[PDB]
From a paper:
The structure of the human major histocompatability (MHC) class I molecule HLA-A*0301 (HLA-A3) in complex with a nonameric peptide (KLIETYFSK) has been determined by X-­ray crystallography to 2.7 Å resolution. PLP45-53, a nonameric peptide, adopts a typical arched conformation within this groove with its N- and C-terminal residues bound in the A and F pockets, respectively. The B pocket is a primary peptide anchor-binding pocket in HLA-A3 alleles. The pocket has a predominantly hydrophobic character consistent with the reported preference for Val, Leu and Met at position 2 of the peptides which bind to HLA-A3. PLP P2 Leu tucks under Asn66 with its side chain directed towards the α1 helix and its main chain involved in a hydrogen bond to Glu63. As a result, both P4 Glu and P5 Thr are solvent-exposed and extend above the binding groove, positioning them as potential TCR contact residues. In contrast to residues P4–P6, the P7 Phe side chain is deeply buried within the groove inserting into the E pocket. P9 Lys is further stabilized by a triad of aspartic acid residues (residues 74, 77 and 116) which serve to anchor the positively charged peptide side chain within the pocket. Substitution of Tyr (the residue in HLA-A2) by Asp at position 116 in HLA-A3 opens the base of the F pocket, providing a sufficient volume to accommodate P9 Lys which would be sterically hindered in HLA-A2. Comparison of the structure of HLA-A3 with that of HLA-A2, an MHC class I molecule which is protective against MS, indicates that both MHC class I molecules present very similar faces for T-cell receptor recognition whilst differing in the specificity of their peptide-binding grooves.
Author numbering:
A (entry chain B): 1 to 98
B (entry chain C): 1 to 9
C (entry chain A): 1 to 274
Amino acid sequence: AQRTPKIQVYSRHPAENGKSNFLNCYVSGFHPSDIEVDLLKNGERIEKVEHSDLSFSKDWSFYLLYYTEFTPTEKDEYACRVNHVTLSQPKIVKWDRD
Amino acid sequence: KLIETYFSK
Amino acid sequence: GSHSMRYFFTSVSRPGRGEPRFIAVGYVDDTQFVRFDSDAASQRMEPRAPWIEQEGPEYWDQETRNVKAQSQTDRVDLGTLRGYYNQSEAGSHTIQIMYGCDVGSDGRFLRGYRQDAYDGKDYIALNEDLRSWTAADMAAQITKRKWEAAHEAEQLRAYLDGTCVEWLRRYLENGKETLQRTDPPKTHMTHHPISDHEATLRCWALGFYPAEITLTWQRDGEDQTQDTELVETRPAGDGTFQKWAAVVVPSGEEQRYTCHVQHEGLPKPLTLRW
């Protein structure tokens, strides 16, 4: 029944400094649905953040897309904070262009 | 189109 | 290729913050077209695709009517199941329902679906004949007997192989340039040394539709399916999906490897040597 989320941080299009884009945090394969997800800019929580509608796979586990428009710069770092009942501690996955 | 008929469980 | 229409419903009880959170999503293939959320300000079945917006108000009124009826039975089902299982009102529980249908390239009925889950475990499901049910535990058997006695599958079958199928065809036509489109994967490979003796080869697929894709790593021809890491196919958020597969390889033997890519959007399967 209980399942740990799998977390992916990535951009919609290949990142290009100075060009607006979308930062995605995709969480899938988890259960139950109650889950906390934040997108971080240099550690600061981002407020204007959208998420998709709750849905599930053939095994009943859930998936969600959290996303926000952004403009990547060379120096700025982005990450995703996920908190879920299966994690002994909130997990922070850093956005890696590579 | 959603189904139009419903039955409790 | 074939098509499908899927509805997904989720109800989670909030003890004791109030009443269940209810969320409903409709899909046509890998494209969401409608949505309902009990917490949204709208309190209406909402469109999530351009082609569905064509439907008149009688359609929308009808759909929000039906989606609230759905939630009101899942709301009552939570109460009923808690009683079947002898559970306390303390804990929070989840009911999940999926139903839908597949049609072929000529729009002929293919398969009908309806499966229910409780707390992330199979509860009850309609078999492929669309005339009988399968219970997962002794609680679901109580439900099974009730539905059999009332012949509830008949009306359900009439929807799955009839109404569902005819409306799916309708959507596929109204949104033909969106739903009957195909977007091939844009592919490339990246190299990642781990140590002096090893490195990861990663095969990327980007911007493809629909979401079904097969990424295979090959060595001198053989398939390395046994030692490959795949991530779950992910939405780019613009209607297309992304995915990659990775092999850990002995350096320097990277040149013996090839990525094989299969996708409905590709005329011929891809073979990429590193």
